[PDB]
Amino acid sequence: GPANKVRFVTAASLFDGHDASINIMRRILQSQGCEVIHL
Amino acid sequence: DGQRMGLAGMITDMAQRCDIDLTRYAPTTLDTVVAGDRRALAQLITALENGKADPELVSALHAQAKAAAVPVLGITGTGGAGKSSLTDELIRRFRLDQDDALSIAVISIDPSRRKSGGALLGDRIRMNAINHPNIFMRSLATREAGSEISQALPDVIAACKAARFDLVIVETSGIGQGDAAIVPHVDLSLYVMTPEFGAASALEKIDMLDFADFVAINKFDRKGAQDAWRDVAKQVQRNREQWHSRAEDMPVYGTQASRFNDDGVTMLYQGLVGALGARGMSLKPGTLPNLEGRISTGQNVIVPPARSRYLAELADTV
Amino acid sequence: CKAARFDLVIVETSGIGQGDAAIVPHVDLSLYVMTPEFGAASALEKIDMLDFADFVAINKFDRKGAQDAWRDVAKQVQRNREQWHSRAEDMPVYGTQASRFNDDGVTMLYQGLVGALGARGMSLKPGTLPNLEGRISTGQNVIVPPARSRYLAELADTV
Amino acid sequence: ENPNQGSFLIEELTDLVEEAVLQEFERIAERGGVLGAMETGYQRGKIQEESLYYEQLKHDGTLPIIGVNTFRNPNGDPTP
Ligand SMILES: Nc1nc2c(ncn2[C@@H]2O[C@H](COP(=O)(O)OP(=O)(O)O)[C@@H](O)[C@H]2O)c(=O)[nH]1
Ligand SMILES: [Mg+2]
């Protein structure tokens, strides 16, 4: 594909104790072969 | 709608839509860079990463780096050792002692996925103490099949050095045993280790110890802390061939990163301050309690392991 | 070595790092060993060797977190496998104990490897050992139940 | 069969040795069981170190051992 790589960042807004949504988003993005910094 | 069209398809459309590179948007000079911008700094970093810059620019970068004269400290070790936490603690101690009067740069390198093509640059998460304009951090991926360093790592190192910062810390990905990709390019070497590392004889074939400047063992909670430290110190002495010293004085100290205000952390910071002074970088006189010692005494620990399994005792009582 | 007309070829590599999986195309079957002390659960999702290992074994329940590591590793193997519709406890990951002789998990791994070799069509005789089942050894034939590791502390308190 | 009559010293030594032994017991327990000790070679190395220290001190001569470090009779040492 294109020499460029997809760089993403994922997180949750202030004061929402749930986190699994971040994980579900990020693992799928990773499956799509995109580099993401999850903070 | 997410259930109807599917999250998978939504992500595919999101991925394909955002597909365009920003290569044309790079600058052509270093004047605004040495000025102090950050967005242009990231622009230069990216352009060097993809190698879209003229060799003249890189030559000027190297020329300025030859006048940089700045500390380049690398920290590496086994995967899952926890080097990132140690780096965070070191940065925190730096800020605490020097009253936020330094210009700290941090570079991390993470492995790529050799199959899917993507990666998970998951190291900035552990660090938390970078909420300041005077400390800058950056992450890069592997992107290459074989090594564990960038195809342009020296270039980005020189670029970061040119920015008139105080000290640059760099960490690679988790290393094997036969790898020394951080040795020749950097100035100072910190290697992390764990108590669960195998037999004592196995300690004699970790090639990283050969060039290691300072070795620290993390997470002293587990068994064999003292025994592991003894064996590590003895092996370091043997490899150094400095038979004139006794064992306890070798420059190897191990700390427990996770628990707050570890004494060994302060000891290692004191040692590294001495090391930088021996290499001569400008810094203010020390201000923290500069203790002596070699291994943390587990200070302020909640439970002396002497009472770890109390619940079994209570059950037996019942 | 293959030209020597032997039954089986086994090759052990050097201690690996994280980005190293060079053995993938040169051999047929992949066994990857691991320790309970490996780092955080989120960390393990970056060990590329799991993308090709036909079998993964955590060895020795010396330290703690053995069952925790087993659960996490099995779940991540499922996650990378894309075999969603199957429960984890059946995944091809087994945890054993080297030092202990006659370990149960070793036997389980041997039975699985026999099955795998039969899949590739390797001539051999029918089985002879008691074909036991399970996924993790119970630590049978152990000298002391870990429950009483620190008996000397009890004696000192007694005195 | 009981020479303790008149003895502070026997009791003092007994209690001190008992405390030292129990402290070493606690250290052994913290080492994680005798089997773990055997696996890690803790006591083997400890004995090695203590033997080296003892031999070093004996060769130093700062410990009085009769008839080895002194009283070297001028007749040489034939020892058939
Ligand atoms: N027991 C213990 N665990 C630690 C300590 N420091 C870090 N850890 C563990 O290490 C994990 C972070 O590892 P990390 O630095 O992200 O992995 P790395 O980036 O590959 O070095 C945390 O989840 C902690 O559980 C410590 O001092 N003691
Ligand atoms: Mg990491």
Swiss-Prot record, chain C:
It comes from Cupriavidus metallidurans (strain ATCC 43123 / DSM 2839 / NBRC 102507 / CH34) (Ralstonia metallidurans). Is composed of four functional domains: the N-terminal 5'-deoxyadenosylcobalamin binding region that is homologous to the small subunit of ICM (IcmB), a middle P-loop GTPase domain (MeaI) that acts as a chaperone for ICM, a structured linker region involved in dimer formation, and a C-terminal part that is homologous to the large substrate-binding subunit of ICM (IcmA). Catalyzes the reversible interconversion of isobutyryl-CoA and n-butyryl-CoA, and to a much lesser extent, of pivalyl-CoA and isovaleryl-CoA, using radical chemistry. Also exhibits GTPase activity, associated with its G-protein domain (MeaI) that functions as a chaperone that assists cofactor delivery and proper holo-enzyme assembly. The G-domain of IcmF also has a role in its cofactor repair. Does not display ATPase activity. Mg(2+) 2 binds at residues 12-13. In many AdoCbl-dependent isomerases, e.g. methylmalonyl-CoA mutase (MCM), its G-protein chaperone is a separate protein. GTP binds at residues 59-62. Mg(2+) 1 binds at residue 12. Homodimer. The chain holds residues 299 to 457 of 1093 of the full protein. It comes from the Bacteria. Transmembrane segments: none annotated. Belongs to the IcmF family. Signal peptide: none annotated. This is Fused isobutyryl-CoA mutase.
